[PDB]
Coordinates of C-alpha atoms and ligand atoms in Angstrom, one line a residue:
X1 CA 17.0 -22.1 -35.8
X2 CA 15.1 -19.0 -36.3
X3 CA 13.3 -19.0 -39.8
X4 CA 14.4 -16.5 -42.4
X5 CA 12.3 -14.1 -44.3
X6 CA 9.7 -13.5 -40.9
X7 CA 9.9 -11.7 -38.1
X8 CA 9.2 -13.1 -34.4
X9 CA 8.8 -10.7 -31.6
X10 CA 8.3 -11.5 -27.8
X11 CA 6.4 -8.5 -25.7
X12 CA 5.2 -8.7 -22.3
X13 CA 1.6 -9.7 -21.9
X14 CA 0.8 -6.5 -20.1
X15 CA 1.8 -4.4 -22.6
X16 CA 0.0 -3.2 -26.0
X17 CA 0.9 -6.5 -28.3
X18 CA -2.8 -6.6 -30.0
X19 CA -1.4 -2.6 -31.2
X20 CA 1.9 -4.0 -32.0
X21 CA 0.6 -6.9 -34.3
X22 CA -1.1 -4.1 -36.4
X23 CA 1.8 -2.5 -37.1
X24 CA 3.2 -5.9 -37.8
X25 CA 0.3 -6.5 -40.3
X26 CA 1.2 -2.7 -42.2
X27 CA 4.6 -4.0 -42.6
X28 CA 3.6 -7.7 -43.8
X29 CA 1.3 -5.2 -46.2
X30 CA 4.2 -2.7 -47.2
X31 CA 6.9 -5.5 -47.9
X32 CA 5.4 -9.0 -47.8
X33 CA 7.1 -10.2 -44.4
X34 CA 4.6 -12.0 -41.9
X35 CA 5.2 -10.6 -38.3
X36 CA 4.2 -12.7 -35.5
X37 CA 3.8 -11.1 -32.0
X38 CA 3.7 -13.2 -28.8
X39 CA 3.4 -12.2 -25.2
X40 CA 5.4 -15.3 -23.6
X41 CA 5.0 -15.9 -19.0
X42 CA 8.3 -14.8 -17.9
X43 CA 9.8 -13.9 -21.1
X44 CA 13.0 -11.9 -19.3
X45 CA 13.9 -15.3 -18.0
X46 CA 12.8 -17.3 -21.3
X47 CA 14.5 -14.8 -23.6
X48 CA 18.2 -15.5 -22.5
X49 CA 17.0 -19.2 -22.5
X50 CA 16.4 -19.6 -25.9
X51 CA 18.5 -17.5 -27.0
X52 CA 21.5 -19.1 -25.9
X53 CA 21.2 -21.7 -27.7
X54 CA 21.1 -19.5 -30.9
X55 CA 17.5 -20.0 -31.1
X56 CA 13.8 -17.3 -30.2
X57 CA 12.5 -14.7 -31.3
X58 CA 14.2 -11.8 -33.7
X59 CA 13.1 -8.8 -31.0
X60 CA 12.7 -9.0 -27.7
X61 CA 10.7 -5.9 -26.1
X62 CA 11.6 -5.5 -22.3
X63 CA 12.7 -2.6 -20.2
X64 CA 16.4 -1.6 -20.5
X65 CA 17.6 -2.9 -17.2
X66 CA 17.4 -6.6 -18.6
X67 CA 19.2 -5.9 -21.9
X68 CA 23.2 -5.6 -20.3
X69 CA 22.9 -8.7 -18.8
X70 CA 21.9 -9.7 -22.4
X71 CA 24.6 -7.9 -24.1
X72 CA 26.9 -9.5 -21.9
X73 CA 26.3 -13.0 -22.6
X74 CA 26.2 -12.2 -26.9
X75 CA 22.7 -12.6 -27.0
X76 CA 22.2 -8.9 -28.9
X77 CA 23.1 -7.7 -31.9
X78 CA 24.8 -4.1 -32.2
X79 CA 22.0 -1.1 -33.6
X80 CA 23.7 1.5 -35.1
X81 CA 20.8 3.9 -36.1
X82 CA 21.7 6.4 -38.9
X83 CA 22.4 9.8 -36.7
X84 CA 19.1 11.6 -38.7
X85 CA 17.0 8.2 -37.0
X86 CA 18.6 9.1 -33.3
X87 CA 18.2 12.8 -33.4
X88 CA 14.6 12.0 -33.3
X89 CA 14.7 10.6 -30.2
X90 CA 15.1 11.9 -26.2
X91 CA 19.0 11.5 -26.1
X92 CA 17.9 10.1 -22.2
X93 CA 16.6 7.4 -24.0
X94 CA 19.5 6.4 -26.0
X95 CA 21.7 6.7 -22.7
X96 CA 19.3 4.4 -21.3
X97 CA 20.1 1.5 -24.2
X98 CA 23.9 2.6 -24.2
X99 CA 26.5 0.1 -22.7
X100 CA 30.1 -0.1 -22.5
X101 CA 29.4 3.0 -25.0
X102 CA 27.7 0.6 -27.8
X103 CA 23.7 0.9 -28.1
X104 CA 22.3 -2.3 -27.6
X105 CA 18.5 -1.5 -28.1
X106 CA 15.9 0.8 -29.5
X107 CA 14.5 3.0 -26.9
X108 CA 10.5 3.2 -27.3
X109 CA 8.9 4.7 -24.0
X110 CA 9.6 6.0 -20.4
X111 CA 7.7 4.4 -17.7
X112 CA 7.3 5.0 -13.7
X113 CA 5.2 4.0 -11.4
X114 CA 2.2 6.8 -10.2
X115 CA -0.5 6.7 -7.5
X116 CA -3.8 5.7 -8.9
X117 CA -6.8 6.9 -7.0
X118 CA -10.3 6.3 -7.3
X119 CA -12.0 9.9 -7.5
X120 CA -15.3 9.1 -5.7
X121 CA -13.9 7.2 -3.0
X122 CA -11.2 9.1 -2.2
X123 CA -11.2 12.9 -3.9
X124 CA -7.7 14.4 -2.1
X125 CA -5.8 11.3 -1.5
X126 CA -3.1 11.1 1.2
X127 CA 0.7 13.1 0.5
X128 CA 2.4 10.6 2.8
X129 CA 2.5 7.2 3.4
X130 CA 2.3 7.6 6.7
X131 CA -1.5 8.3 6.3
X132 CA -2.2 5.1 5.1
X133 CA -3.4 3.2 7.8
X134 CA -5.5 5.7 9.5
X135 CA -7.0 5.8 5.6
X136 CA -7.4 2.1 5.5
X137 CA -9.3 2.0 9.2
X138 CA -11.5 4.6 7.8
X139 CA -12.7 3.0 4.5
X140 CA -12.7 -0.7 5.7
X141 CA -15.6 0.2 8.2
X142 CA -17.4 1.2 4.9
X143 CA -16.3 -2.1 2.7
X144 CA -13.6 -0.6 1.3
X145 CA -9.6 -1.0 0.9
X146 CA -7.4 1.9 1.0
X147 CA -4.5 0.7 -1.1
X148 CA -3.9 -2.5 -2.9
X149 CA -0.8 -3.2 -5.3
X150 CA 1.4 -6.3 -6.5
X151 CA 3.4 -7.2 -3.4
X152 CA 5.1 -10.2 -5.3
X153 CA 7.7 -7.6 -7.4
X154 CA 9.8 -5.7 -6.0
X155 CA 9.6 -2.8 -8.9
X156 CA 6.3 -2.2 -7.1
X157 CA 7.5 -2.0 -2.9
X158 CA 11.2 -0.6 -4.1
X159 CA 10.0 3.1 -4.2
X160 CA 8.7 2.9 -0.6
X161 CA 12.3 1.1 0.4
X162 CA 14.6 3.4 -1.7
X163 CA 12.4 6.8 0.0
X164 CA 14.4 6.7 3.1
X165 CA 18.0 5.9 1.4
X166 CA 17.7 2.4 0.1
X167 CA 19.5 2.3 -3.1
X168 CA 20.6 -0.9 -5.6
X169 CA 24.4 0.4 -6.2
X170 CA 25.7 3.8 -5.4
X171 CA 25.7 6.5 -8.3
X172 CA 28.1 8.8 -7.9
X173 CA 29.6 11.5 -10.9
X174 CA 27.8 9.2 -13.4
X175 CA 29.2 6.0 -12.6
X176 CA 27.9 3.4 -10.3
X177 CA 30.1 1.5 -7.9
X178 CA 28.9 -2.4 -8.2
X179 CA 30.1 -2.8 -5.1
X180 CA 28.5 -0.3 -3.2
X181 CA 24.9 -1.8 -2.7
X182 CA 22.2 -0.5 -0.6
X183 CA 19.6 -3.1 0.1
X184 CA 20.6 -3.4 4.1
X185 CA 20.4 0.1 5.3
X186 CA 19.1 1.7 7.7
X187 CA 16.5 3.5 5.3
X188 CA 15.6 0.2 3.5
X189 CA 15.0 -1.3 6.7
X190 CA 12.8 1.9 7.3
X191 CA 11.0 1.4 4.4
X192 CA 10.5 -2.2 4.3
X193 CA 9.6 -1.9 8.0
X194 CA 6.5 0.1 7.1
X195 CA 5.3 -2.1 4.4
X196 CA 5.6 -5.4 6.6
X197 CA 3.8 -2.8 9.7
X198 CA 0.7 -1.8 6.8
X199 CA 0.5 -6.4 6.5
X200 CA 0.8 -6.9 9.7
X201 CA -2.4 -4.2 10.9
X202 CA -4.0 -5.7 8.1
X203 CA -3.9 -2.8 5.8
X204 CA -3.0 -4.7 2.6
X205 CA -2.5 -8.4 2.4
X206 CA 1.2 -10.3 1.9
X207 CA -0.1 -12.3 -1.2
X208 CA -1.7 -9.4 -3.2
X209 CA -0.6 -9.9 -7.0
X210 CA -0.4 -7.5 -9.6
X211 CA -4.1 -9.2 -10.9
X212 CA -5.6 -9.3 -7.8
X213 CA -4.7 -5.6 -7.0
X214 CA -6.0 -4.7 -10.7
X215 CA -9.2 -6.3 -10.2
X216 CA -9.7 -4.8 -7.1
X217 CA -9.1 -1.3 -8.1
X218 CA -11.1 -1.9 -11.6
X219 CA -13.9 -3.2 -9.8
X220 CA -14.3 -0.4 -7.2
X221 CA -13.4 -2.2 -4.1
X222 CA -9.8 -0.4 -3.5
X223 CA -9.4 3.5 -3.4
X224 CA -6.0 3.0 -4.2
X225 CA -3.4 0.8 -6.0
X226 CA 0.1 1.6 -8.0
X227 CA 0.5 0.7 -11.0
X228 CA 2.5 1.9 -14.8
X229 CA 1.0 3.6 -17.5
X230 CA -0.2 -0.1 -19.3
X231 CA -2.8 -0.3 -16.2
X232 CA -5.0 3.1 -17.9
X233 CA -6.7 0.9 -20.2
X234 CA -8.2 -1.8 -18.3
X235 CA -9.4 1.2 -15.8
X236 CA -10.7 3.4 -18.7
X237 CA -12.9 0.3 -19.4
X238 CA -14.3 0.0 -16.0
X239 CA -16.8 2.6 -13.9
X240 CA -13.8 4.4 -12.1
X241 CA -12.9 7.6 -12.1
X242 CA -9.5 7.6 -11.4
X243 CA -6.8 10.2 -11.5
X244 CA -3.0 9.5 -11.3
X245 CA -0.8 11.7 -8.9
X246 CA 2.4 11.5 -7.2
X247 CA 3.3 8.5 -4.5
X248 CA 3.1 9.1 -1.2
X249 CA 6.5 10.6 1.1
X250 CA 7.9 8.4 3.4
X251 CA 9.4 10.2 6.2
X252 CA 9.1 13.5 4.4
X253 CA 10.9 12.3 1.8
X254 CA 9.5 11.3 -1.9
X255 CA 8.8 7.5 -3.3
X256 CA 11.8 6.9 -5.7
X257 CA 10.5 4.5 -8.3
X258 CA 13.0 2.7 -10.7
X259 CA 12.0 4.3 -14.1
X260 CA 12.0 2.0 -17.1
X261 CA 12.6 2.6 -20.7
X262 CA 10.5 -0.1 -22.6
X263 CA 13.3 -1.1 -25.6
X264 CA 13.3 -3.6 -28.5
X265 CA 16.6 -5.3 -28.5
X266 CA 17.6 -7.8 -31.6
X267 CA 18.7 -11.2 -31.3
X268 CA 22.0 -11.7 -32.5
X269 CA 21.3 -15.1 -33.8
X270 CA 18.5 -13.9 -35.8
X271 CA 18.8 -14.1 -39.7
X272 CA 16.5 -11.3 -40.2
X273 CA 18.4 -8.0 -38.5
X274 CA 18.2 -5.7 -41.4
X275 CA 14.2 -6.8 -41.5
X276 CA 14.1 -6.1 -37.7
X277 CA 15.9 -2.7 -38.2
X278 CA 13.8 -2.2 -40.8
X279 CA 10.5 -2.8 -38.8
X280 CA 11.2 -1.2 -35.5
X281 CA 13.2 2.4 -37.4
X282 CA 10.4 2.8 -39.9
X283 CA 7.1 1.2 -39.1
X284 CA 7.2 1.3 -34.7
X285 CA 9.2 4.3 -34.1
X286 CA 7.2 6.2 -36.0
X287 CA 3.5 8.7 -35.1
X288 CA 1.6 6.1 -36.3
X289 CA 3.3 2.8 -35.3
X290 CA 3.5 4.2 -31.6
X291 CA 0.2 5.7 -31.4
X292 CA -1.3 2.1 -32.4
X293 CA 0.4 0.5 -29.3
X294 CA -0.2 3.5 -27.4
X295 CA -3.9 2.8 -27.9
X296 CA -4.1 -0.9 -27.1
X297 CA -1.6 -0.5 -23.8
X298 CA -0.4 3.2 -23.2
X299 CA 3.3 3.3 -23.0
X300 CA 3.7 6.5 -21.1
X301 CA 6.0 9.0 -22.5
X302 CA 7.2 7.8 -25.6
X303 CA 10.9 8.1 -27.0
X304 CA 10.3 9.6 -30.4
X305 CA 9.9 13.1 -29.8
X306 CA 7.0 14.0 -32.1
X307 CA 4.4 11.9 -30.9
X308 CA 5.8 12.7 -27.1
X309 CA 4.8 16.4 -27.8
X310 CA 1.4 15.1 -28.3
X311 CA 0.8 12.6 -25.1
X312 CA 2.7 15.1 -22.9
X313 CA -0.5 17.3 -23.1
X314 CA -2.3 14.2 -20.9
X315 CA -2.1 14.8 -16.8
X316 CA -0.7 10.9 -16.7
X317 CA 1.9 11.8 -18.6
X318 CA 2.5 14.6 -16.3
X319 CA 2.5 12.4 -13.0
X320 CA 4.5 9.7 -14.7
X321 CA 7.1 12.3 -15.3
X322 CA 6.9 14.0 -12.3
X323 CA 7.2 10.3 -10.0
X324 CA 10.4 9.4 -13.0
X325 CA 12.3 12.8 -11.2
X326 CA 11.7 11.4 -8.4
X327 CA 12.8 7.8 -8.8
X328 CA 16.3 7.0 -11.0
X329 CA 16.5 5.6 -14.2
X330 CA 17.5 1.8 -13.8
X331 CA 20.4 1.1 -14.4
X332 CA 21.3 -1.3 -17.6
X333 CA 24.2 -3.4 -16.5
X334 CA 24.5 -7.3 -15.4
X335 CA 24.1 -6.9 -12.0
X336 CA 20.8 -5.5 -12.0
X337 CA 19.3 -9.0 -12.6
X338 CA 21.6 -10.0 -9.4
X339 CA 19.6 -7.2 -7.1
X340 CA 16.3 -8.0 -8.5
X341 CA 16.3 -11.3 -7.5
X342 CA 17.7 -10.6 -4.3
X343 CA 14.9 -8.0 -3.4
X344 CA 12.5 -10.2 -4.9
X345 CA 13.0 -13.1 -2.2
X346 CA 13.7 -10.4 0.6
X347 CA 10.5 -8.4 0.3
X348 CA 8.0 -11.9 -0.1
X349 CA 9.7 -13.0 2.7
X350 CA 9.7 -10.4 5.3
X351 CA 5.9 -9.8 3.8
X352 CA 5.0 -13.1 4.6
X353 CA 6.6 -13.3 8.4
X354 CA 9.3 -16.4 6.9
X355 CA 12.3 -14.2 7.6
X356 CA 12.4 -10.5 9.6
X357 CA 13.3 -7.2 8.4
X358 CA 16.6 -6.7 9.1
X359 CA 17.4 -10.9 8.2
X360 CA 15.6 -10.6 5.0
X361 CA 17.4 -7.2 4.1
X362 CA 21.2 -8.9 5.3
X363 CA 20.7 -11.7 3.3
X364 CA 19.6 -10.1 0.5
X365 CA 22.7 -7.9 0.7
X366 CA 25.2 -10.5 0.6
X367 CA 23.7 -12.6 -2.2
X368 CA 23.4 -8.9 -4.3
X369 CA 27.2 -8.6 -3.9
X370 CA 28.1 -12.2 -4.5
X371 CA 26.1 -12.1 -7.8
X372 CA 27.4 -8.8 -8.5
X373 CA 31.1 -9.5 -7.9
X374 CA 30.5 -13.0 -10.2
X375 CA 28.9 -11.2 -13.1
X376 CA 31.7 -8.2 -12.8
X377 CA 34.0 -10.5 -15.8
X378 CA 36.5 -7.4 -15.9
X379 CA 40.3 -6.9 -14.1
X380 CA 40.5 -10.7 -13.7
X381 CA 43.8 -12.9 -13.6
X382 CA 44.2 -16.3 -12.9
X383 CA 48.2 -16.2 -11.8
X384 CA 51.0 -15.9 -9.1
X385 CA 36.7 -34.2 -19.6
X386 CA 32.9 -34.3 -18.5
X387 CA 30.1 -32.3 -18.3
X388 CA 29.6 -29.6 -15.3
X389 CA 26.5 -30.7 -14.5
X390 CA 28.1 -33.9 -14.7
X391 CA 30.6 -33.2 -12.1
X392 CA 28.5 -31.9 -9.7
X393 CA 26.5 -34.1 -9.7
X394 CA 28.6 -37.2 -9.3
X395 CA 30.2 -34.5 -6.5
X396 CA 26.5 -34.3 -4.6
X397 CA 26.2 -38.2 -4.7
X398 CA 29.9 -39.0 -3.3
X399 CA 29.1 -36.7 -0.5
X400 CA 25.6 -37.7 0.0
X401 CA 27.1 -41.4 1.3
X402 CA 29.2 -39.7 3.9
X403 CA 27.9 -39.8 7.3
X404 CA 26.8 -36.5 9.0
X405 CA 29.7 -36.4 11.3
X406 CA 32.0 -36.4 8.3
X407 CA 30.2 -33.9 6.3
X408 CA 30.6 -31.0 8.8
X409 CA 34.3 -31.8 9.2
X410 CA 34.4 -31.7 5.0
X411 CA 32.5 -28.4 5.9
X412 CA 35.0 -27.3 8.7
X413 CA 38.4 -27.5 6.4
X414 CA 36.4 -26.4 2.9
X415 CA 35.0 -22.7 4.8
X416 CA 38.4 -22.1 5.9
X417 CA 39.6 -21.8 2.2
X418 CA 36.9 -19.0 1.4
X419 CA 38.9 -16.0 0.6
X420 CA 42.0 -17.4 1.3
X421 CA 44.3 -18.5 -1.2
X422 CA 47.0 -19.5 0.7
X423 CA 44.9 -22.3 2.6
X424 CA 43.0 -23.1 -0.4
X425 CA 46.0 -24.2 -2.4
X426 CA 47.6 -26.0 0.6
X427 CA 44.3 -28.3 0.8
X428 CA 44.9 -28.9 -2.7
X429 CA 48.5 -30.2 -2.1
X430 CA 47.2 -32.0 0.9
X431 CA 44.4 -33.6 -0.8
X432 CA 46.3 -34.3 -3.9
X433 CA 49.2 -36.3 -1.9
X434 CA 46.5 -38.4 0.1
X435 CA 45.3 -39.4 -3.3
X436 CA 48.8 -40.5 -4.6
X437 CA 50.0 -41.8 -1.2
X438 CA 47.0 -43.0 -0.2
X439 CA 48.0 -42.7 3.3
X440 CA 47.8 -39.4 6.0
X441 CA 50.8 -37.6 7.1
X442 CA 51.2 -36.0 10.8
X443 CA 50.5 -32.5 8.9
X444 CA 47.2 -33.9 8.0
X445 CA 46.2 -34.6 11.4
X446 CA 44.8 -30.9 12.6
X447 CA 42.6 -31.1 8.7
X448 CA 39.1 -32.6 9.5
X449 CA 38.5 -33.3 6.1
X450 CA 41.9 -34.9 5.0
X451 CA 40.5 -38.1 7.5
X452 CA 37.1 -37.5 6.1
X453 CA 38.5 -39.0 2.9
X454 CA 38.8 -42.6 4.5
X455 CA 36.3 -45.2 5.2
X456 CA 35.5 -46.8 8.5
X457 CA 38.2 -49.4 7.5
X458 CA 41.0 -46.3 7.5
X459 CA 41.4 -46.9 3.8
X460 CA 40.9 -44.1 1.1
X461 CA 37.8 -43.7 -0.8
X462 CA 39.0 -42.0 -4.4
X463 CA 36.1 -40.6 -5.2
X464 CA 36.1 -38.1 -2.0
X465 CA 39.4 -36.9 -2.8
X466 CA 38.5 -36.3 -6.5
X467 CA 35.1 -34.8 -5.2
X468 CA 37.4 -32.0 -2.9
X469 CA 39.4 -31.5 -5.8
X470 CA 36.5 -30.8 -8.3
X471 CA 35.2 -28.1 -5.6
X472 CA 39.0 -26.5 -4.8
X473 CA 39.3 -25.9 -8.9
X474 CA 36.1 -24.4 -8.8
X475 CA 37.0 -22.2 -6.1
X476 CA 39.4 -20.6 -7.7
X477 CA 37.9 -19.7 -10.5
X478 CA 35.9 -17.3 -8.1
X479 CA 37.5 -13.8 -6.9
X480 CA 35.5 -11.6 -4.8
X481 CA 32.1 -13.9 -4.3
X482 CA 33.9 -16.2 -2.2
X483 CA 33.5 -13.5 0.8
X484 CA 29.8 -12.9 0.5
X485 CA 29.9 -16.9 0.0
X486 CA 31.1 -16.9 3.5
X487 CA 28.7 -14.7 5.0
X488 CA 25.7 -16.7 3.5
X489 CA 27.5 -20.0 5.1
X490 CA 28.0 -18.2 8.8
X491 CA 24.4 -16.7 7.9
X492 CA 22.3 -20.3 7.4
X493 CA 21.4 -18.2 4.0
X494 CA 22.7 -20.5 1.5
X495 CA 19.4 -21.7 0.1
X496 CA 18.6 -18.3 -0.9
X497 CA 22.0 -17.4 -2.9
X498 CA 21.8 -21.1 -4.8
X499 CA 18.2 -19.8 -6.1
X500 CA 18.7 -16.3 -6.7
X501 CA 22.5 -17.7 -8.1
X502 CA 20.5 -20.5 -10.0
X503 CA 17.8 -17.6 -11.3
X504 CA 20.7 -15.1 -12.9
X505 CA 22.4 -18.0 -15.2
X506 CA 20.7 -16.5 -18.2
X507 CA 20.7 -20.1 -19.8
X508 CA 19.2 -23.8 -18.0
X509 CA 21.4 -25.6 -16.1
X510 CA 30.7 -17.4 -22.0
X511 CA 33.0 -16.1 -19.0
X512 CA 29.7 -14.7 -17.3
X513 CA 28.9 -18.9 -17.9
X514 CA 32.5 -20.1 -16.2
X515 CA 32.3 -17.9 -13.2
X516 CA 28.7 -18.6 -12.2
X517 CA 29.3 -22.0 -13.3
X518 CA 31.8 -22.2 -10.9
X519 CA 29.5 -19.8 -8.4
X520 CA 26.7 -22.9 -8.4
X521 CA 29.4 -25.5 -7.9
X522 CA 30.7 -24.0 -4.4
X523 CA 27.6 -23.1 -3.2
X524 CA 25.9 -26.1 -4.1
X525 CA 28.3 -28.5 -2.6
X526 CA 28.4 -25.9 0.9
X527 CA 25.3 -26.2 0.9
X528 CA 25.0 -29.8 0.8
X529 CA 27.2 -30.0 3.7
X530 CA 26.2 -27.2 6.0
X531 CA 22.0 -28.4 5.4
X532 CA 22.3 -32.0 4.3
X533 CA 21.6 -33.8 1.5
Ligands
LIG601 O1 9.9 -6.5 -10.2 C1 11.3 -6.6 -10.7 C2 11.3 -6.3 -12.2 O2 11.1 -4.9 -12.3 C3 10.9 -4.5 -13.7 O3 9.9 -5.2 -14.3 C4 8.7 -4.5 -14.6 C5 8.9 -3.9 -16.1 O4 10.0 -3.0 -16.1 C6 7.6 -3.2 -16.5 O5 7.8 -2.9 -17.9 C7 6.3 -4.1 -16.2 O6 6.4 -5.3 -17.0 O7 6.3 -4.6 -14.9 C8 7.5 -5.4 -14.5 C9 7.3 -5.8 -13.0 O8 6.6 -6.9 -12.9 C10 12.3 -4.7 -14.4 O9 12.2 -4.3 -15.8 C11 12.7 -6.3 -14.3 O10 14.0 -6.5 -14.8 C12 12.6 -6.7 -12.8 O11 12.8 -8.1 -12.7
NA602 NA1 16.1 11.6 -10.2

């Protein structure tokens, strides 16, 4: 229960919350309503968490790619901004927050990714990537780093991996095409090949975090690093001089950052909306309201058009813009959760040496589309008593007593229903008269796991039969996935989709709900099988 009469609002910790609490206090001042800002660890997962359950904060400040998935699962309320409020805005910005043509957050600044240099190290820094290690070779022999930046997310490595042709899905005429993704390609594999290249010659180091690369570059040691407009402050505090430029090419061609729009989304069990509407039209959005965030955390180039007229006159603002048309603007729909995780695990683990290139890149492909396809709740049709988590796991236990032998020929007759429909309901016949009969027929003979179903003693054990049939419902509630399910099966890359699948269920372990629901059932209970328990 969210309490009536205050506003809560969650911000990431590296942006400008000690700015956004004062315009909290001028509103408490103006109207009497105590505003509480917190700055939550991995509020984008938290977020849809608690809120799910009806409960956190009234607004939630992320960047837009994060608020369809939200949308999707209810967890928004609807703004609709009087047109004189909107017409004071970039009308980018609003396309950024639009989905399935309703607005679903209040835009409040642009933000890309620049080149930060460090003037006295390094006065003309290097136009192409492809410089870098020569650069590095040069400066280590003087105590120095050439480039250091968060390797652990994927927003930070995907410009270098999209230069080449890497792409999440394919943009064509203004609509995407969810099932046209481009994490396995050959410029991805380019681009990912050179980053894991730089590691491997020791030119930057596969655990390198965002605060690691920060204090690096803060405390001199680095002549490079890439970072977002929030980083300016912490480096105007320090000795550096530092300018901000465009990335580095990669094979001629320019670093395509994933552009953000920062946005304040409402939570559409909160009791205070018309406060929160209130708050973030009149006191945020507003010269004054943005320029005290702006000078805690600088937002970059800021939605509301007046005070954007101002900042533009900043070089930052310049290079931010300049590296946003080069990258593309995010995207805001479900899937994009699907490809971050993906790319998340891919990159770390072709970084750290657990998986190569091109297997880190395939796998992240498939699980990509399998989230993608389970998230995609539209043009569905189904037609020609205890708890999920209860289910599966009293599935998981009655497979866990079968010996190994048996558990591959489970695994054998369950991987032949994946995409098929035809064999998937002819198991469930099967399986369904073996229960009833309790006996096998000669057209059970050639199904492995029809005689996996009996004991040692050739009699029937119920609860294998009931397990099969929990997992064949399940699989039918899934369409498309069941393919890429395949291909992580045939792959050994099941571990990795039940995380990243695990990850994308906004809420702990809704049609979004019933389909990845389902999702975590089949690959759970593969998995089992194929991996042991
Ligand atoms: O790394 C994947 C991550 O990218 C973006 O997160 C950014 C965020 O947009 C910035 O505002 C700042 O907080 O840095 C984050 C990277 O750590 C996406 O917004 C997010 O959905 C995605 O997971
Ligand atoms: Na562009």
């Amino acid at each position: 229960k969210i309490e009536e009469g205050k506003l809560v609002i969650w911000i990431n910790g590296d942006k400008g919350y000690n700015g956004l609490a004062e315009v909290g206090k001028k509103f408490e001042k103006d109207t009497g309503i105590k505003v509480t800002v917190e700055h939550p660890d991995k509020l984008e997962e938290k977020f849809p968490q608690v809120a799910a359950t009806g409960d956190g904060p009234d607004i939630i400040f992320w960047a837009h790619d994060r608020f369809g998935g939200y949308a999707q699962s209810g967890l928004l309320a609807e703004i609709t901004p009087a047109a004189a409020f909107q017409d004071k805005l970039y009308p980018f910005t609003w396309d950024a927050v639009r989905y399935n043509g309703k607005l679903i957050a209040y835009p409040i600044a642009v933000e890309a990714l620049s080149l930060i240099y460090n003037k006295d190290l390094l006065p003309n820094p290097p136009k192409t990537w492809e410089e870098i290690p020569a650069l590095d070779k040069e400066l280590k022999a003087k105590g120095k780093s050439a480039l250091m930046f968060n390797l652990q997310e994927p927003y930070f490595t995907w410009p270098l991996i999209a230069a080449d042709g890497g792409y999440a899905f394919k943009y064509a005429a203004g609509k995407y095409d969810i099932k046209d993704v481009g994490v396995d390609n050959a410029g991805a594999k380019a681009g990912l090949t050179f980053l894991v290249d730089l590691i491997k010659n020791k030119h930057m180091n596969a655990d390198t975090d965002y605060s690691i690369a920060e204090a690096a570059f803060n405390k001199g040691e680095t002549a490079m690093t890439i970072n977002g407009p929030w980083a300016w402050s912490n480096i105007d505090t320090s000795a550096v001089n530092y300018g901000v430029t465009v990335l580095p090419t990669f094979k001629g061609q320019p670093s395509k950052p994933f552009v953000g729009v920062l946005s304040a989304g409402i939570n559409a069990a909160s009791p205070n909306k018309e406060l929160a509407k209130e708050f973030l039209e009149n006191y945020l959005l507003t010269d004054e309201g943005l320029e005290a965030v702006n000078k805690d955390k600088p937002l970059g180039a800021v939605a509301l058009k007046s005070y954007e007229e101002e900042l533009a006159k900043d070089p930052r603002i310049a290079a931010t813009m300049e590296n946003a048309q080069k990258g593309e603007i995010m995207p805001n729909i479900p899937q994009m959760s699907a490809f971050w995780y993906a790319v998340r695990t891919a990159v770390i683990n072709a970084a750290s040496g657990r998986q190569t290139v091109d297997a880190a890149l395939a796998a992240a492909q498939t699980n990509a589309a399998a989230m993608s396809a389970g998230l995609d709740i539209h043009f569905r049709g189904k037609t020609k008593s205890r708890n999920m988590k209860e289910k599966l796991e009293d599935m998981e236990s009655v497979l866990k007593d079968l010996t190994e032998e048996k558990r591959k020929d489970v695994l054998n007759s369950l991987a032949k229903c994946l995409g098929k429909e035809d064999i998937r309901q002819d198991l469930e016949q099967r399986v369904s008269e073996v229960l009833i009969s309790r006996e096998l027929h000669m057209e059970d003979s050639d199904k492995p796991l029809l005689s996996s179903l009996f004991n040692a003693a050739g009699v029937l054990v119920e609860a294998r039969a009931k397990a099969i049939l929990d997992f064949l419902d399940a699989l039918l509630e899934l369409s498309e996935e069941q393919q890429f399910v395949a291909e992580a099966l045939e792959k050994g890359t099941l571990p990795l989709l039940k995380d990243q699948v695990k990850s994308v269920m906004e809420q702990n372990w809704d049609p979004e709900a019933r389909i990845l629901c389902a999702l975590y059932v089949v690959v759970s209970i593969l998995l089992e099988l194929a991996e042991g328990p």
